[PDB]
Amino acid sequence: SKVSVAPLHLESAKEPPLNTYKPKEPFTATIVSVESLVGPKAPGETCHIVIDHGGNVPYWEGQSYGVIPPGENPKKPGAPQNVRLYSIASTRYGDNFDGRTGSLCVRRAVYYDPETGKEDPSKNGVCSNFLCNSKPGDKIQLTGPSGKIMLLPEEDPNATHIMIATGTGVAPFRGYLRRMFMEDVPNYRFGGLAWLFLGVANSDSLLYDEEFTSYLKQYPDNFRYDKALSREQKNRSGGKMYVQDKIEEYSDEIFKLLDGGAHIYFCGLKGMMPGIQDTLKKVAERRGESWDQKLAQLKKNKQWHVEVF
Numbered sequence: 001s002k003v004s005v006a007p008l009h010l011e012s013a014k015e016p017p018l019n020t021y022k023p024k025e026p027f028t029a030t031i032v033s034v035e036s037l038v039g040p041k042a043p044g045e046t047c048h049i050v051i052d053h054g055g056n057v058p059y060w061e062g063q064s065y066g067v068i069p070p071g072e073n074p075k076k077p078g079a080p081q082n083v084r085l086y087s088i089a090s091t092r093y094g095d096n097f098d099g100r101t102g103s104l105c106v107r108r109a110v111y112y113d114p115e116t117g118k119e120d121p122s123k124n125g126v127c128s129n130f131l132c133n134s135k136p137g138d139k140i141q142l143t144g145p146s147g148k149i150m151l152l153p154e155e156d157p158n159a160t161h162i163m164i165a166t167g168t169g170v171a172p173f174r175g176y177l178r179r180m181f182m183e184d185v186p187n188y189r190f191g192g193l194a195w196l197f198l199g200v201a202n203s204d205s206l207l208y209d210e211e212f213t214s215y216l217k218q219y220p221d222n223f224r225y226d227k228a229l230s231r232e233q234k235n236r237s238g239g240k241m242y243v244q245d246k247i248e249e250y251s252d253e254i255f256k257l258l259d260g261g262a263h264i265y266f267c268g269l270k271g272m273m274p275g276i277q278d279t280l281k282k283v284a285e286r287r288g289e290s291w292d293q294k295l296a297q298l299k300k301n302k303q304w305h306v307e308v309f
């Protein structure tokens with residue numbers, strides 16, 4: 001059954017915390033654990049980082065943490081590095097169910113010369129490698145939390161939530177789904193439909209797959225889960241199987257859910273959105289609908305939630 005979480009006073013706040021810590025005086029947090037989430041055929045490493053904030057930097061599901069990597073700002077010499085934002089991949093209780101830790105899902109940004117493949121440490125992404133290189137006991141400068149675009153609408157505990165992720169965009173949805181299904185939160189008993197779509201490069205690039213697959217067995221009447229593996233599957237038209245091609249497999253069901261008030265969420269690299277928009281336009285057209293009109297209605301009704309980067 002559901003996992004006991006503490007302390008339940010984390011449910012009492014009426015508003016999400018924002019900018020509790022700021023870049024000029026960050027909170028010095030401590031790494032608990034760092035682990036790769038992916039197998040050897042993945043094109044890059046994505047790691048799972050557990051951070052002990054001691055209860056000093058609480059957050060709501062869907063928010064972001066800021067991390068200030070070490071070193072001087074290369075463009076304001078003598079200045080600290082700029083904040084990098086990461087979608088929190090944990091619930092407000094965290095992976096230890098105690099309200100003291102939060103987790104990040106971090107893709108290593110690694111530079112390869114386009115012609116030769118050669119590497120260059122001055123060109124790798126600073127914060128992402130800093131995080132995935134971290135070890136238990138390392139200190140991390142933490143800011144935030146910040147963001148409200150991806151807060152979970154909880155007014156209707158029987159709402160429908162359609163979650164569209166690529167890569168590390170799965171992060172907010174890991175938090176949503178633990179709150180909906182895994183944790184014992186007496187004031188939020190989810191009885192709607194949660195539907196996760198995840199696009200990644202191949203089977204070895206899947207993120208948290210065992211957790212999501214378990215929800216199919218635990219909550220078969222409230223959870224659905226579909227994956228698109230681009231390098232390893234192909235779409236109806238011969239293209240690489242992308243998350244939008246999976247949406248298209250369920251186009252009638254999805255459009256009916258949207259018309260019924262479902263929330264729909266998008267998270268991941270911003271390059272995911274043009275193909276999704278193209279697919280939704282073609283789906284609408286086949287149904288004899290205007291996607292522009294439909295998207296405007298969804299935004300007007302506060303059903304459309306996008307955090308891409």
Ligand SMILES: Cc1cc2nc3c(=O)[nH]c(=O)nc-3n(C[C@H](O)[C@H](O)[C@H](O)COP(=O)(O)OP(=O)(O)OC[C@H]3O[C@@H](n4cnc5c(N)ncnc54)[C@H](O)[C@@H]3O)c2cc1C
Nearest residue numbers: 084085086087105106107109123124125126127128168309
């Ligand atoms: C709201 C929000 C949420 C986010 N959520 C996440 C998340 O959950 N997970 C996640 O992994 N990321 C996330 N991001 C992205 C994250 O904030 C960083 O932008 C990303 O991790 C890269 O930061 P970095 O410090 O590693 O790279 P930077 O040091 O900022 O470098 C940026 C890029 O430039 C490249 N580069 C550097 N120098 C050169 C050069 N000379 N020539 C060519 N290329 C070069 C690097 O390789 C890198 O790809 C999020 C961003 C936003 C805005």
Ligand SMILES: [Mg+2]
Nearest residue numbers: 038039204206
């Ligand atoms: Mg795997």
